[PDB]
């Protein structure tokens, strides 16, 4: 027990991501009160009521309240311009942010986030999508719209979720993270990965070598939709984009599709409903457009289902702030199920909590980045000088 | 508050190496008490008598008191049958275990693991390998035999010393952990790493293509050694096996050892004086005969080392099995030094030790596994069954 | 022999290599001239800051 | 030179001449200190000159 400059640091430092699985599916499949008799029945339709209630809390109050602000994050109005508060939020946004709060252990070294510009402009333009549209298009078509990572406006946290693809596929190919930069660029998406990590990886997973019958499918085919998301879908919007998209999401890639995730009524319904700005503006008009018409649809809230008065198990946004929202090891997804459940993998979360997950066992993309920076500057202990105390304490 | 079936659960579980480094030569270099003057210089040779001062402790009585045995390793008193202790341990020792004790933290999921039934004997011939014939080869020579992750008896956890050198070329390629076991097998070089795992990674990090001029300059070689390690070293001794070994490791395959392996003369010096059963025969021998000459050497311990009984400084390992073994995160290295000093530590290990630790050790190149098996069985709580109760608190 | 980096080069290499050596000799100071335990008339730099620096004349040498 | 010329403890004797060469010993027993921890502590510090710590990063003593 000898002595040489010590402390005590705290730190941060990690990436996030978020994907639109059927995850909601489950949250909203209308189990939180189909089958409650307090005769409230009375009003009409209950389809899309409790679905809706997913969103207007989990993105803007509740996640956006103190993840997103106080990560270091100096907010811009025109995102928050209005704080909401929606007493809808069932036994899942309280629940559900305890479940996704975007932020890992200090006494780890963890944080999240890469794209809340871009994310949120999507997740909104889902919300209105989806909420809007036709309410539950039955797993298949708005899960695939969701979990396609649709359409973006050149930013969009897709090439992860594409990223995910790939990598799952290539066994013994182990890719350089430098892979999840392959999301945008024209080149580099036909040299660093596809051809290089491809040509050298690729030429392995599946080697086909075909002749005079082009290499379809068999790796072979990922890569050109990867070098296809590469340049085609950059280049701007018009059919050009879906349709080369679409073309690349539709058909002859029915086997590119296989890998991640499609239905012929996510592209092809969803991708031929939506009008490629449909994630752009979209993403705009649904913020200076959808988010005041949020409003409505939040004040339909506030006015309509807030009637739901008469019940007795709701309660208001209360503006966190001090309620925060980070903390939930939400990192490495924890789940496996045969015959009896089984929570696994790294992110020493919680006792009470843990378990307590089954309603919703929060996944953010993550890429988790190994950082403690015990940073330490020495220009008052040359290592040499303890050495030498140190050293004149085993002489006697 | 949503808390369903929860617990409380502690794990282990994660990998662990070991290297003989340069590191020794830096704490057996004569510091610790060198230029003390109490006369003790009463005609007697202090050059090896401090180097070999470390050695009985640092691999029984410290580590493998605690570590090992209490690590739920049914150990064999033939490996720790003289549990003897030695005194000389100055202040590296009590000190280099808390630098080297292996066990990692419970609040994060690691610990300890890699052959010690063929390191410790590897280790014990080192020390007798070392401490016998050359006392201080100067870095050179004897730190090689060291680091060369000298010859093996067939396990030998050289394979990842070895690991270390082609992953670090390949900066393009990462690879699947199954490279780890690239060690010993016939067809680790013809198959998977070689020619899958370098015709797809290695044909991009190394694509040299020559004609007519043999392609092994260009790290198609660092493969040959690689296949050489495969087939030629395991089919035994044949004494050129180190002439094999020795040929992979000299003979122009100096271009090839120089990724991460020492200098040839420790291997003709060493390697070819030693005998190839230096490592196998020399670790059994050296266990039962150089380990109760270990004692006649612990004599010189508790007799040559005992002979310091005036200096007063002296007085070490007293316990064991009291004082354990593990938890101290000396493990990824992780250290730069510019100017100042900055020790990055990876996982949150310590801070009144971190500073300290930094003194001299910083221990292996453990091979993580990020495991916090949370399990959990559902007869009981079919996860409808509670998603069905916290239902029945957002219906009313 | 010095080789005239050995006043600019040197220096700098002497203050991060032989500043930091300085411990190496300044342990000569620190552990050789720490060996001088027993003698008992050494004892000299306990504060500065304190202690200050400036105030003697012993400037204009004549 | 005049300083180090050993006559602060050439003549003594103490029977440290334990094996032992007092040669540079002695010159070289001042340097670490006459001009980082003595003089460059408060002569340049306090002199209104803002020093940088690479000039003075191992503050040690002698």
Redesign the interface.
Same mark, same amino acid.
């Given at each position: 027990?000898?002595?040489?400059?010590?402390?005590?640091?705290a730190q941060g430092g990690s990436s996030d991501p978020v994907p639109m699985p059927g995850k909601y599916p489950v949250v909203f499949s209308t189990?939180?009160?189909e089958?409650?008799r !307090?005769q409230e029945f009375a009003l009409p339709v209950h389809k899309a009521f409790p679905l809706f209630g997913s969103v207007s809390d989990k993105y803007r109050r509740n996640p956006r309240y103190a993840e997103f602000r106080a990560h270091s994050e100096f907010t811009d109005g025109v995102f928050g311009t209005h704080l909401a508060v929606s007493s809808l939020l069932?036994?899942?946004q309280q629940?559900v942010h305890?479940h996704v709060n975007m932020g890992l252990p200090l006494? !780890?070294?963890a944080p999240l986030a890469s794209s809340d510009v871009r994310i949120p402009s999507a997740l909104a333009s889902v919300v209105n999508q989806f909420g809007e549209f036709s309410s539950p298009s039955i797993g298949t078509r708005f899960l695939l719209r969701d979990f396609e990572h649709a359409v973006s406006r050149v930013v969009f946290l897709a090439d992860q979720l594409w990223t995910n693809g790939n990598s799952h596929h290539i066994?013994?190919?182990?890719?350089?993270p430098m892979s999840n930069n392959d999301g945008n660029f024209k080149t580099i998406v036909a040299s660093r990965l596809l051809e290089?990590?491809s040509?050298? !990886?690729l #030429?392995?997973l599946p080697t086909v070598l075909e002749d005079a019958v082009l290499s379809g499918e068999v790796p072979e085919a990922w890569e050109q939709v990867k070098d296809l998301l590469g340049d085609a879908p950059g280049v701007g919007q018009v059919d050009r984009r879906d349709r080369f998209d679409f073309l690349f999401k539709s058909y002859a890639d029915v086997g590119q599709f296989t890998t991640a995730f499609t239905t012929q009524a996510a592209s092809d319904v969803l991708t031929e409903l939506g009008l490629p700005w449909n994630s752009p503006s979209a993403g705009h008009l649904n913020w200076q457009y959808s988010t005041k018409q949020r409003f409505t649809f939040l004040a339909d809230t506030w006015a309509k289902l807030s009637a739901a008065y008469s019940?007795?198990?709701?309660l208001s946004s209360g503006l966190a702030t001090r309620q925060s929202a980070t903390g939930s090891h939400a990192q &490495?997804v !924890?789940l496996t199920?045969v015959?009896?459940?089984?929570?696994?993998?790294?992110? +020493?979360?919680l006792?009470?909590?843990?378990?307590?997950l089954?309603?919703c066992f929060p996944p953010s993309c993550i890429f988790v980045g190994? +950082?403690?920076?015990?940073?330490?500057?020495?220009? #008052? +202990?040359?290592?040499?000088?303890?050495?030498?105390?140190?050293?004149? &304490?085993?002489?006697?």
């Open positions: 027990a000898s002595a040489s400059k010590a402390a005590a640091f189990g939180a009160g089958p409650t !307090d069932r036994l899942a629940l305890a006494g !780890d070294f066994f013994a190919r182990s890719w350089l290089f990590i040509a050298g !990886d #030429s392995i019940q007795f198990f709701e &490495m !924890d199920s015959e009896g459940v089984t929570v696994l993998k790294a992110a +020493l979360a006792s009470a909590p843990e378990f307590s089954a309603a190994g +950082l403690t920076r015990r940073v330490v500057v020495t220009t #008052s +202990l040359s290592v040499s000088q303890r050495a030498t105390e140190f050293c004149q &304490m085993d002489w006697r």
